[PDB]
Design a binder for this molecule. Structure first.
Ligand SMILES: [K+]
Ligand SMILES: [K+]
Ligand SMILES: [K+]
Ligand SMILES: [K+]
Ligand SMILES: [K+]
Ligand SMILES: [K+]
Ligand SMILES: [K+]
Ligand SMILES: [K+]
Ligand SMILES: [K+]
Ligand SMILES: [K+]
Ligand SMILES: [K+]
Ligand SMILES: [K+]
Ligand SMILES: [K+]
Ligand SMILES: [K+]
Ligand SMILES: [K+]
Ligand SMILES: [K+]
Ligand SMILES: [K+]
Ligand SMILES: [K+]
Ligand SMILES: [K+]
Ligand SMILES: [K+]
Ligand SMILES: [K+]
Ligand SMILES: [K+]
Ligand SMILES: [K+]
Ligand SMILES: [K+]
Ligand SMILES: [K+]
Ligand SMILES: [K+]
Ligand SMILES: [K+]
Ligand SMILES: [K+]
Ligand SMILES: [K+]
Ligand SMILES: [K+]
Ligand SMILES: [K+]
Ligand SMILES: [K+]
Ligand SMILES: [K+]
Ligand SMILES: [K+]
Ligand SMILES: [K+]
Ligand SMILES: [K+]
Ligand SMILES: [K+]
Ligand SMILES: [K+]
Ligand SMILES: [K+]
Ligand SMILES: [K+]
Ligand SMILES: [K+]
Ligand SMILES: [K+]
Ligand SMILES: [K+]
Ligand SMILES: [K+]
Ligand SMILES: [K+]
Ligand SMILES: [K+]
Ligand SMILES: [K+]
Ligand SMILES: [K+]
Ligand SMILES: [K+]
Ligand SMILES: [K+]
Ligand SMILES: [K+]
Ligand SMILES: [K+]
Ligand SMILES: [K+]
Ligand SMILES: [K+]
Ligand SMILES: [K+]
Ligand SMILES: [K+]
Ligand SMILES: [K+]
Ligand SMILES: [Mg+2]
Ligand SMILES: [Mg+2]
Ligand SMILES: [Mg+2]
Ligand SMILES: [Mg+2]
Ligand SMILES: [Mg+2]
Ligand SMILES: [Mg+2]
Ligand SMILES: [Mg+2]
Ligand SMILES: [Mg+2]
Ligand SMILES: [Mg+2]
Ligand SMILES: [Mg+2]
Ligand SMILES: [Mg+2]
Ligand SMILES: [Mg+2]
Ligand SMILES: [Mg+2]
Lengths: 97, 194, 101, 82, 212
RNA sequence: CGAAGGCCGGGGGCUAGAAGGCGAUCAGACACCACCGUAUUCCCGGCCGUAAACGGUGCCGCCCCGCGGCCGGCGCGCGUCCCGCCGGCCGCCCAGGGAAACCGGGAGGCUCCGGGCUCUGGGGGGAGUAUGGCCGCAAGGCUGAAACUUGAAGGCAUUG
RNA sequence: UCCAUUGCGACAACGAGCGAGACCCCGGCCGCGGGCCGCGGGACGGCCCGCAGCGGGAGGACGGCGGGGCGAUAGC
């Protein structure tokens, strides 16, 4: 077991301790700077009915509301559900989204 | 003064918003939007110095001219056409200076490159077989394994063509081939890429 | 599902480059053309010859859409009658700090 | 000169070249070393045959890019530039 | 006979180059072993096989075995060389090692401990070398002292022309290839150390340069 | 002074939840999964003194190729910007170093070895054990052997 | 991308070789010769549309020919 990453697998810079979050899939405790974080904006009605709601609406000029959700998962759940992948040694250095 | 006017039309005097410490001596001012400007007098003195380095070699076919950039390709086949240097136009194949079994292998005495980040393989390979090098260098250039820089704009076609045209003219002047203090029969347009 | 091996292709390229004038883009004439020993071609079998000719015929109708090296050279040497070089805030400061201006 | 015998004879096989910039000895198998020469016109803008100046640079000065300024400074001391 | 593949080897074939020290003075690589063999005709070089090692690559069906051979050459009078070679058969590995040993010849500088009477008889001054974990110290010694070194180091010091030397070795010197590499590197640095004997400035005259 | 768990005496008590109970699964399941739940989790006054208490990297001082990001203070310039300076937190990296991974604001300036100070180690087990001492309400903590046994244990890296 | 380390194209690698394929045997359709056997022609991703090659049509005896033979380096 040598060192695998320069950040030790987290984003902790000039502090001793950080907050705890609960994984939204399995509910384990994870430090906040380690948890995998994604933000999503979606429509409350699925796009496959997004025009039939609209055509059956009495209010003139209505606009379909949206949902704003920040999903946070642990390492195990992120790998299992394919939010992140295991990468090659060269590829691990890439930070591009 | 006429060549100064040509340098102004080609804009051979504008950098790329970043400056290296070793090119700091060639800078004159900074444009507000961040672009740097070269002192053209220093550019001409480097051109003359490079010319006075090129003519020490008796046979010019042992000078290598390497330029991978498309916008310079035409310009390097004409520099040879009037000086008789040896051009390596496209992708430089590893081994050309170190591997004797290659078909285009050679053993030159001067390497002349166009850009130091493009054409990096030629510069790195020349350091294994004792070749000095001269490079056209912009404001962000890294001068590792380079002996003579030439401050200039090395992206726009007019700049590149006019630069090789000036170099070939001063070499043909120094050797005595073409007359001194008289405009060369060759128009610089023959160097610029259409 | 019929991929030509390098052996077909490498012979087909020398055949098309050497015999550009003889090869129409239609196949029977090229089948004859991959037969002569004067356009010297030692094809040791007729199936092999047919495959090579099938790739040669295809190479023919790709150059339409040497005659394209004479003109490329004869257009790299043309100097027009113009010269292509016939506002500043910081370079002005540099021409004053050099010469006449 | 080199190392001497007790009587006064140099018992050295060969003398390495010295760097024109950093005075360091070149040494064999230092294949990044370069020697190169400059024209020294002196004659109405035209060169004179077989009358040059010649400097040498070890690989250490090249590996960091110090030569573009040091060569210029060396030239400004020999009346080849300004 | 042999036809040169390089301009230097083409130049040596005629009467252009007089000795090895001109090729070392302007430090150029040597790519043909008959360039070396032209300057040392027929057995002024001693060639001795230091080591043969069996190396194994693991494979789906079983182990693949090859051999690695380490060879040193010298002339007892100021030249040493060290090469290595890998092959399926031992004979070819040794052949490759001997060729590589001939292309790696370097000159060695000698001097005087104390009295400067005759020929230089020991290292010119303290030398140090590193290879792998091995480190070596060659210390100048008086006359009659001999070559005080391990039997691996003593052969390299014998081929090099060094009569009197003290030696210290640190690291895992049982690894024979790194031992010989460290001693070789120490001998190779001998002509790159500034001593007051060499301070005097000189003019370079391009007429003598072999023009790379 | 010192996370969490733990202890003594008071208070409080939503949630979650060692222990315990119960439904499944399974050859078995005293576990993983479901459900219910005591101490605990929170406040006050004390005790205990340990964590992968980690950057697995002691403290003070000097020199050190460069390219960037962010935070605090200040100064010059044009017409918010822009260039610097000091202090902090980060990324990449030439040389140099190293068994290498890697470090590079040091893990550099070191077999070419010496700026100052404090602590710790000397093959693997036995063993952090026995014994004695000090501290603690307890749980512990700190200090800490020998007989005897053994030819390797271990690091980083390559191919399958 | 292909049945395929079959190929395009890119590259601190450049250039070769083996295995693959090509090759051999058989059988479909047509000619010259002999008296059915024995010598050749024939098919090639060749034509036409749609996007190295994947699709859809057509003619033709046969449509991407079909069934076999051979069979790398290293080994148990
Ligand atoms: K480990
Ligand atoms: K570790
Ligand atoms: K972590
Ligand atoms: K922080
Ligand atoms: K924080
Ligand atoms: K994240
Ligand atoms: K996890
Ligand atoms: K190099
Ligand atoms: K405490
Ligand atoms: K605690
Ligand atoms: K408690
Ligand atoms: K409660
Ligand atoms: K409570
Ligand atoms: K508990
Ligand atoms: K339970
Ligand atoms: K259990
Ligand atoms: K279990
Ligand atoms: K419950
Ligand atoms: K408790
Ligand atoms: K409680
Ligand atoms: K808690
Ligand atoms: K509580
Ligand atoms: K506590
Ligand atoms: K520990
Ligand atoms: K840690
Ligand atoms: K300390
Ligand atoms: K800030
Ligand atoms: K700031
Ligand atoms: K701050
Ligand atoms: K600030
Ligand atoms: K600030
Ligand atoms: K600041
Ligand atoms: K600072
Ligand atoms: K600072
Ligand atoms: K700073
Ligand atoms: K810092
Ligand atoms: K201490
Ligand atoms: K300690
Ligand atoms: K300790
Ligand atoms: K300890
Ligand atoms: K006891
Ligand atoms: K007690
Ligand atoms: K008690
Ligand atoms: K108690
Ligand atoms: K007790
Ligand atoms: K007790
Ligand atoms: K105790
Ligand atoms: K181990
Ligand atoms: K260990
Ligand atoms: K271990
Ligand atoms: K360990
Ligand atoms: K290693
Ligand atoms: K190892
Ligand atoms: K490749
Ligand atoms: K017959
Ligand atoms: K017959
Ligand atoms: K055909
Ligand atoms: Mg306390
Ligand atoms: Mg509850
Ligand atoms: Mg409950
Ligand atoms: Mg502890
Ligand atoms: Mg700790
Ligand atoms: Mg610790
Ligand atoms: Mg920051
Ligand atoms: Mg930070
Ligand atoms: Mg940092
Ligand atoms: Mg100690
Ligand atoms: Mg006790
Ligand atoms: Mg006790
Ligand atoms: Mg290893």
């Amino acid at each position: 077991m040598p060192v695998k990453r320069r950040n030790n697998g987290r984003s902790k810079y000039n502090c001793g301790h950080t907050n705890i979050v609960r994984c939204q899939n399995c509910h384990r405790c994870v430090p906040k700077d380690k948890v995998i974080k994604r933000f999503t904006i979606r429509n409350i009605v699925d796009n496959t009915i997004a025009d039939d709601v609209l055509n059956a609406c009495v209010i003139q000029g209505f606009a379909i509301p949206k949902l704003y959700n920040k999903v946070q998962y642990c390492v195990s759940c992120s790998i299992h559900n394919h939010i992140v992948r295991v990468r090659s040694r060269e590829d691990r250095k890439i930070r591009t989204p | 003064e006429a060549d100064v006017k040509k340098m102004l039309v080609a804009t051979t005097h504008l950098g790329v918003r970043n400056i290296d410490r070793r090119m700091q001596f060639y800078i004159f001012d900074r444009q507000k939007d961040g672009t740097f400007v070269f002192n053209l007098q220093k550019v001409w003195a480097k051109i003359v110095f490079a010319a006075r380095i090129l003519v020490t070699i008796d046979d010019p076919a042992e000078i290598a001219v390497v330029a991978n950039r498309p916008d310079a390709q035409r310009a390097i086949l004409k520099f040879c056409k009037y000086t008789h240097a040896t051009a390596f136009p496209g992708r430089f194949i590893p081994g050309n200076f170190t591997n004797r079994m290659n078909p285009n292998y050679c053993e030159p005495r001067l390497l002349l490159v166009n850009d130091p980040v493009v054409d990096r393989q030629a510069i790195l390979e020349a350091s294994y077989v004792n070749i000095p090098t001269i490079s056209l260098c912009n404001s962000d250039a890294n001068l590792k394994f380079i002996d003579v820089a030439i401050p200039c704009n090395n992206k726009t076609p007019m700049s590149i063509g006019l630069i090789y045209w000036l170099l070939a003219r001063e070499v043909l002047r120094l050797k005595g081939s073409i007359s001194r203090t008289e405009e060369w029969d060759v128009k610089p347009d023959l160097f610029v890429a259409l | 599902g019929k991929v030509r091996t390098k052996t077909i292709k490498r012979a087909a390229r020398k055949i098309v480059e050497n015999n550009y004038e003889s090869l129409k883009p239609k196949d029977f004439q090229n089948n004859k053309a991959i037969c002569s020993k004067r356009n010297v071609a030692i094809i040791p079998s007729k199936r092999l010859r047919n495959k090579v000719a099938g790739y040669v015929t295809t190479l023919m109708n790709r150059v339409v859409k040497r005659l394209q090296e004479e003109e490329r050279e004869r257009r790299d040497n043309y100097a027009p009658k113009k010269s292509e070089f016939d506002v500043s805030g910081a370079t002005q400061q540099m021409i004053d700090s050099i010469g006449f201006k | 000169i080199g190392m001497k015998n007790s009587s006064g004879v140099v018992v050295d096989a060969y003398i390495p070249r010295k760097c024109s910039a950093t005075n360091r000895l070149i040494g064999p198998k230092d294949h990044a070393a370069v020697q190169l020469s400059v024209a020294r016109v002196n004659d109405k803008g035209k060169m004179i045959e077989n009358n040059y100046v010649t400097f040498a640079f070890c690989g250490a000065i090249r590996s960091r890019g110090g030569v573009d300024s040091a060569f210029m400074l060396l030239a400004q001391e020999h009346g080849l530039m300004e | 006979e042999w036809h040169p593949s390089t301009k230097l080897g083409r130049l040596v074939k005629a009467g252009k180059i007089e000795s090895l020290y001109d090729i070392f003075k302007y430090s150029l690589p040597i790519k043909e072993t008959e360039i070396i063999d032209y300057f040392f005709p027929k057995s002024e070089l001693a060639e001795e096989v230091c080591n043969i090692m069996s190396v194994q690559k693991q494979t789906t069906a079983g182990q693949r075995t090859r051999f690695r051979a380490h060879v040193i050459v010298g002339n007892r009078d100021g030249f040493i060389g060290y090469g290595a070679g890998v092959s399926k058969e031992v004979a070819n590995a040794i052949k490759k090692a001997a060729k590589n040993a001939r292309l790696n010849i370097v000159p060695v500088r000698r001097g005087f401990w104390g009295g400067k009477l005759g020929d230089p008889h020991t290292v010119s001054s303290k030398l140090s070398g590193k290879c792998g974990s091995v480190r070596v110290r060659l210390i100048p010694a008086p006359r009659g002292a001999g070559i005080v070194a391990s039997p691996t180091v003593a052969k390299v010091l014998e081929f090099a022309g060094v009569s009197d030397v003290f030696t210290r070795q640190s690291g895992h010197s049982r690894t024979l290839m790194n031992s010989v590499g460290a001693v070789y590197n120490a001998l190779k640095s001998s002509y790159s150390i500034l001593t007051p004997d060499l301070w005097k400035k000189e003019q370079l005259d391009h007429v003598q340069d072999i023009r790379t």
